[PDB]
Design a protein around this ligand. Structure first.
Ligand code: FAD
Ligand code: CDP
Ligand code: FES
Ligand code: FES
Ligand code: FES
Ligand code: FES
Lengths: 155, 287, 797, 50, 51, 156
């Protein structure tokens, strides 16, 4: 076991972790940040997507031990003092979620994608969200949610 | 989903990493972007008792120019390849083709070096590295050696890389002014490995092909250079007939594996089609 | 102002935002794997590496000595409790843990209980099992051959099952509906005839959240609590009680937030039973959560029908008869979700949207070395197959007559005035207006212009692409209910709703259903809002907890709006009637002298004199008018008089790359009519999702097996799931033809997009090859398969 | 005690268990399925123990 | 008081009262047992939760 | 500064670090979730917090956790064995020796030890031997009957 210190949602977390522990299990089992989900074992779905050191990463294909000294953000940390983040508001307003299983990952991806590309086209949105699968929405509303968030971020 | 137990190591230098490889032997594996290695470990395909993480080694990072050679750190992440102003100006092919690799999240971890070192016939960089005539710098206990992309791939998951070596950087000559290029990739969906793919780099002189490099993805146990196909074009006028001849020559060297992406019949025919589309798109980009 | 008050309610017809979004968008949803209880252990399953064979020996010692491991159970530990086999909704029995042999690859052989999922996984690898491979049965046809191996050795000697007599050891049943004599007669004298064979490939619902549960038996209190991914927690409770011996009132099953169902989470899987047994044995909580590969490989699959459709007609296109014969592959055990009396579901709905005078169908169930299932993917109990068949046949008949595919449909449609229409199979369609909807769709896409573009493209033999136009006009049948004909394990297919108004005007409501993301917490509240004049925002709805919610049959087959929607309205209306009675006492007038206006009872003539629902609620708790009991609440169990028949008209335009076999959906127009609409926004989401499932199934999904019975492509590596890039932009439209018998005229709609889209895609792909004589092409229409057909009909390159 | 029997014929009876199942299985015409009730009691007088 | 009889015969009962040790979970069950012919052991009574 | 200690509660080692002022009752309730033992006063009169420490009945609200490093603590959650109720638990159940059940855990732990100190107690001895435990519901009558029941079961 290696002792690490990861900054999760703005707070330092000094923990002892087994090297094989996937970041997704560390987030869900150790910190109880159960927003992030698991939809596959092949790294396709992206329901485990979290923001690590400025980038969108699928936490099921990253080790917690690798986050020693890293800056990690989850969906629980998106809202600011209770006020929803643009992306959270966008998915709500544009009905971008149903069962809500892929939502945390979608929000974390959109949160980063919008900083990568502030004024994306529909094609750019769809392509920029390719690492996230959804079984309920058909993606169409998710596109509108991202567009909605983009308009408010430049407001 | 659950990977087997293993010991973890995180060296800060290539030398320490090389030392660890020698000390631990074959039971150790270099961990890079982890998007091929971890998935395999999570399915119990590979069970190394030691993982040597190389993400904390700064000398394996960075993109620079030394003369007319573009030096790319083995640990360069796929997205950094796409956003790199150097790669966009000097090697436009790599910047655009990297967009066809996996998805955004995977591209934030998977590195060009790991994509090459993995040696999967399904990966894109092997063919790409051949079309651009890249060279790989490998460091071991005895020092450094440089091997060509064309000759690096030996078999499925097998390359010239030795068990005590670490690929340090990918060196590729900058595109000469007016170089045409292309990478046609037939895939079932975005983020999936190619059913068939073709990388092309070419130069023009009047109505003829003055320089030509053709490589094939996922149509044999390794990525392939198609020299006979190249020979159907070099010093000849770029015509429909010549392009068709190149495809046939490329088709002739295919040895596709049958899986859910299709049979040998389909993959071979798609390789030819991608060659035809690649050459045409490359010619269009020449000046 | 009265209009303003109605708007303030956010009830029927409003596109109000969802009440359930708050928690989900902040990661505060409560799914099964999010649950952690004191002393909770984790369970993992040892699965069969082969498709068929006897179990020689299971080695438990290496796993038992492993630090962290508490137990390793096998079928032997289940026999004393008579739980090594469990009953199914199809009247058959499925193995909980393989006993003498394994019937399909990935089948549950043993379980391990450890401190966590990591150690648990190591324990499964430590458990070694020896087998004696036996000949495998993959093709339904080979299964019926005289020398076919005996799969169900447990059924040896039996000549009858739960669905009639059995003609072979691998034969599960044979079911039929319609007039065979009359239909055979029609076909014999029909001037025009067509027959086509088509395979509806086995696919998987693959909900993003896999199946799982946290079973917890408390030896001190003597009762069981199981949090589970179940689409019917109440019946699960009844079944669990029966098999455990634990009185039903001491068994509590709770479906929390579920990450999608789509019919995949309707049945009881062996993992649940083992978790329960393990929890009962160890005296503490046990968690089981399957991985993606386990979900695709062992939970309920859909389709897998081999169909032989026939259509009799006259030269002008009027359909005279319909004859269908089917071979159904149900896997090793028949656990196909269905009402007890329908082993092939409502397949006899295959008469479609057409007035066909005579028809007959016959479905033959067959056992194979595969995982059980059959009904589980927005299919409404085999309606997906019925619609695909009829629509495919109509196209075949259209092409033979050189008649336009829309024209032949308009000519055969059941006319608006014919409803309620009784079909050749016995169904009484509630209502419809197909003609108006069809013209609406054809006009919006400029259908004639489309055919001209297609004709112009076919004329040029060098056209790099092929243009295809698919059109489907279908009728659904949702709201599985009439207890006389529909029942799950003996329980009538009714549903319920209990609404309770509080002293201050707000309310709490519970139903026997269970949403999995379809929005019941919003929509259900909207129904009550309009019925009682209480804003939907403060009508808190809950489902899934068998210990608090009224008994129901859960949600699948789009039965919620039809059945629960009616119970909600009726329970609300019981409250409204008492409220009127109370308002009369307060206003010192007679009930008949009152008028309900949105949210208040006002005296006829004098508007200033009135009493709001808030006023009435308070009075109910303050001092009840003589004759009435205090309080304001109601309960209602609705046994539906008939199903609901929503319809649709979908059109799709595709362009096929002749050089690669790639198919690009250029356009898709979907028109659905589900009667009265509760929330247009929520309806639009269901359509988008279902059409997407349709695209996935028709263009990519499949579950192939090799000669040895190994499942291929059982992970996201190959199992097709469209991303935002592959998914096309959907265009939606609608009409409103209310269900006359329904309390609010609303029909189900969630499964319509799935059912209808699949044949629309095939219609478009086949239509692209129609000019060279192609009548049908089996799904999936992947580029590999379309290219194969492109080369066969000389259209490649 | 725990069953409804036919007057003058003990052999013909139905226990609360039989009735309960019947309630969920097939409700007699004019009856909703299920078997439950609620009651709000407003007492007519107090109770006077001694 | 609200009583719900389950398909198998057992039952759940809830009242608007709240015991603090006087034995309601037992006595209430006894009243219902005699009225319905269902043993008191399987008549689960509960109180105190406004929801 | 927190002190690292290991307390044996119901035969199980409990490794924790607590401030010296931490009363045993809060340690059992707050740190171990063994919420059977209760708090009914702040003057050491009620006995609702009675647990068995190193073979003696002790009011955990008047003892420090930090004084139990290596001690053998017995709580109500540990009286039963393999699910089978201890004679004392069976006694209170069969004789209706509890109503609200707040003093019960303490009464049981005390009865458990008292019955070893005095196997064949007279009524007077029972009432006296149980004086450190207050009860607001029972009136003590059924409690002495419960102890007499447990006494008899232990001798057979
Ligand atoms: C869902 C998904 C889709 C994908 N799709 C594609 C696709 O379409 N096209 C494609 O090309 N790839 C694809 N990939 C793979 C990513 O492109 C592979 O991520 C990466 O192949 C293996 O690179 P890595 O940096 O992750 O390294 P790792 O996973 O660590 O693997 C590195 C392998 O090479 C060795 N290695 C790594 N770095 C070095 C080094 N510097 N020196 C020596 N040896 C080294 C390791 O020991 C190991 O054997 C996909 C991956 C996923 C999960
Ligand atoms: N006429 C209709 C039918 C469904 N719906 C809504 O769509 C969602 C799915 O309804 P449904 O009855 O077809 O399916 P399930 O909810 O049984 O999956 C439920 O929230 C709805 O209330 C609607 O608003 N109007
Ligand atoms: S769980 Fe599917 S990509 Fe991480
Ligand atoms: S909302 Fe259910 S998978 Fe996305
Ligand atoms: S709490 Fe009263 S004596 Fe301990
Ligand atoms: S039973 Fe209440 S204080 Fe003893």
């Amino acid at each position: 076991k290696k002792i690490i210190t990861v900054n999760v949602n703005g707070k330092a977390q000094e923990k002892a972790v087994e090297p094989r522990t996937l970041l997704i299990h560390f987030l869900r089992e150790e910190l109880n940040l159960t927003g992030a989900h698991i939809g596959c074992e092949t790294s396709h779905c992206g329901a485990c997507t979290v923001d690590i050191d400025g980038r969108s990463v699928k936490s099921c294909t990253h080790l917690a031990v690798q986050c020693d000294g890293s800056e990690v953000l989850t969906v629980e940390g998106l809202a600011n003092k209770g006020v929803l983040h643009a992306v959270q508001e966008g998915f709500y307003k544009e009905h971008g979620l149903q069962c809500g299983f892929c939502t945390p990952g979608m929000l974390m991806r959109a949160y980063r994608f919008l900083q990568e590309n502030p004024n994306p086209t529909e094609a750019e949105i769809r392509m920029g969200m390719t690492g996230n699968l959804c079984r309920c929405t058909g993606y169409q509303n998710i596109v509108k949610a991202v567009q909605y968030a983009a308009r408010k971020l430049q407001e | 989903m659950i990977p087997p137990r293993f010991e973890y190591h995180a060296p800060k230098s290539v030398g320490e990493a090389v030392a660890l490889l020698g000390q631990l032997g074959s039971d150790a594996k270099l961990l890079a972007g982890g998007h091929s290695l971890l998935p395999m470990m999570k399915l119990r395909f590979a069970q190394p008792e030691h993982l040597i993480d190389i993400n904390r080694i700064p000398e394996l990072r960075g993109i620079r120019e030394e003369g007319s050679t573009v030096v790319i750190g083995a640990m360069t992440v796929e997205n950094d390849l796409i956003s790199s102003p150097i790669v966009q100006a000097r090697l436009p092919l790599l910047a655009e083709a990297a967009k066809l690799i996996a998805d955004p999240q995977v591209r934030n971890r998977g590195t060009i070096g790991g994509d090459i070192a993995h040696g999967d016939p399904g990966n894109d960089h092997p063919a790409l590295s051949i079309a651009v005539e890249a060279h790989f710098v490998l460091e071991g206990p005895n020092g450094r050696r440089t091997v060509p992309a064309d000759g690096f791939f030996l078999g499925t998951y097998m390359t010239l890389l030795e068990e005590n070596e670490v690929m340090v950087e990918i060196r590729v000559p900058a595109f000469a002014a007016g170089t045409g290029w292309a990478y046609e990739k037939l895939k079932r969906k975005t983020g999936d490995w190619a059913t068939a793919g073709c990388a092309v780099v070419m130069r023009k002189s009047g109505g003829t092909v003055s320089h030509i490099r053709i490589a094939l993805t996922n149509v044999a146990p390794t990525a392939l250079r198609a020299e006979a196909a190249e020979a159907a074009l070099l010093g000849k006028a770029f015509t429909k007939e010549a392009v068709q001849a190149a495809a046939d020559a490329a088709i002739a060297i295919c040895e596709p594996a049958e899986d859910l992406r299709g049979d040998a019949d389909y993959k071979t025919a798609m390789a030819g089609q991608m060659v035809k589309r690649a050459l045409n798109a490359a010619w269009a980009r020449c000046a | 102002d009265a209009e303003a008050r109605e708007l303030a309610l956010a009830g029927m017809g409003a596109s109000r935002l969802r009440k359930e979004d708050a928690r989900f968008i902040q990661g505060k949803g409560n799914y099964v794997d999010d649950i952690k209880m004191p002393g909770m252990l984790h369970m993992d399953i040892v699965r069969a590496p082969i498709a068929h064979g006897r179990i020689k020996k299971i080695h438990k010692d290496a796993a038992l000595a492993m630090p962290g491991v508490h137990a390793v159970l096998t079928a032997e530990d289940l026999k004393p409790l008579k739980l090594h086999w469990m009953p199914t909704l199809a009247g058959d029995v499925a193995a909980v843990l393989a006993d003498e042999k394994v019937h399909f690859q990935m089948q549950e052989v043993a379980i391990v209980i450890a401190d966590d999922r990591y150690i648990a996984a190591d324990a499964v690898e430590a458990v070694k099992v020896e087998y004696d491979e036996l000949p495998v049965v993959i093709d339904p046809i080979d299964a019926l051959k005289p020398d076919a191996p005996v799969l169900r050795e447990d059924l040896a000697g039996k000549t009858s099952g739960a669905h009639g007599p059995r003609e072979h050891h691998n034969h599960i049943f044979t079911w039929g509906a319609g007039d065979k004599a009359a239909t055979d007669a029609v076909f014999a004298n029909a001037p025009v005839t067509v027959s086509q064979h088509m395979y509806y490939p086995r696919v998987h619902p693959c909900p993003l959240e896999t199946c799982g549960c946290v079973a917890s038996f408390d030896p001190i209190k003597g009762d069981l609590t199981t949090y589970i991914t179940s689409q019917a927690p109440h019946v699960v409770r009844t079944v669990v009680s029966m098999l455990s011996g634990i009185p039903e009132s001491k068994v509590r099953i709770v479906s929390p937030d579920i990450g999608g169902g789509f019919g995949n989470k309707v049945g009881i899987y062996p993992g649940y039973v083992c978790a329960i047994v393990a929890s009962i044995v160890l005296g503490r909580p046990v968690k089981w959560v399957e991985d993606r590969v386990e979900n695709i490989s062992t939970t309920a699959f859909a389709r897998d029908y081999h169909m032989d459709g026939e259509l009799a007609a006259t030269p002008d296109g009027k359909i005279l008869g319909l004859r269908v014969n089917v071979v159904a592959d149900h896997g090793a055990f028949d656990a196909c979700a269905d009402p007890t009396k329908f082993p092939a579901g409502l397949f006899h709905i295959c008469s479609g949207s057409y007035d066909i005078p005579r028809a007959h169908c016959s479905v033959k169930g067959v056992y194979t070395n595969k995982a059980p299932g059959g009904v589980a993917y927005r299919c409404s109990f085999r309606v997906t197959e019925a619609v695909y068949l009829i629509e495919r046949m109509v196209d075949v008949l259209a092409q033979k007559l050189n008649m336009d595919k829309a024209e032949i449909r308009a000519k055969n449609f059941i006319r608006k005035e014919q409803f309620p229409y009784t079909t050749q199979f016995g169904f009484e369609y509630d209502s419809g207006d197909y003609h108006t909807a069809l013209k609406k769709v054809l006009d919006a896409v400029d259908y004639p212009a489309l055919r001209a573009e297609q004709a112009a493209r076919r004329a040029d033999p060098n056209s790099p692409t092929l243009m295809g136009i698919g059109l489907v006009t279908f009728t659904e049948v949702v709201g599985a209910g009439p207890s006389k004909m529909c029942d799950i394990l003996g329980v009538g297919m009714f549903d319920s709703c209990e609404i309770r108004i509080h002293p201050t005007g707000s309310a709490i409501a519970r139903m026997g259903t269970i949403t999995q993301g379809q929005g019941h917490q919003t929509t259900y509240a909207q129904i009550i809002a309009t019925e009682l004049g209480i804003p939907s925002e403060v009508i808190q709805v809950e489902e899934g907890d068998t210990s608090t919610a009224p008994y129901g049959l859960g949600t699948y087959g789009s039965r919620s709006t039809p059945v629960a929607g009616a119970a909600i309205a009726l329970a609300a209306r019981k409250i409204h009637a008492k409220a009127r009675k109370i308002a009369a006492h307060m206003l010192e007038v007679n009930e008949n002298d009152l008028d309900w206006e949105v949210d208040r009872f006002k005296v006829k003539g004098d508007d200033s004199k009135f009493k709001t629902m808030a006023d009435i609620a308070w009075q109910a708790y303050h001092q009840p008018p003589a004759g009435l009991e205090p309080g304001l609440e109601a309960v209602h169990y609705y046994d539906p008089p008939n199903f609901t028949y929503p319809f649709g008209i979908y059109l799709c335009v595709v362009d096929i790359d002749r050089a690669t076999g790639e198919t690009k959906v250029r356009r898709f127009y979907a028109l659905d009519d589900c009667g009265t609409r509760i929330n247009p926004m929520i309806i639009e989401g269901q359509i988008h999702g279902g059409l997407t499932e349709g695209y996935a199934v028709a263009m990519g999904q499949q579950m192939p097996f090799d000669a040895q019975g190994n499942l291929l492509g059982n992970t996201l590596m190959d199992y097709f799931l469209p991303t935002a890039v592959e998914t096309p932009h959907w265009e939606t439209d609608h009409t409103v033809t209310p269900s006359p018998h329904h309390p609010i005229g609303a029909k189900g709609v969630a499964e319509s997009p799935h059912v209808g889209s699949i044949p629309t895609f095939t219609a478009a792909v086949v239509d692209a090859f129609a000019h060279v004589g192609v009548t049908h092409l089996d799904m999936p229409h992947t580029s590999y398969r379309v290219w194969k057909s492109l080369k066969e009909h000389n259209l490649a390159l």
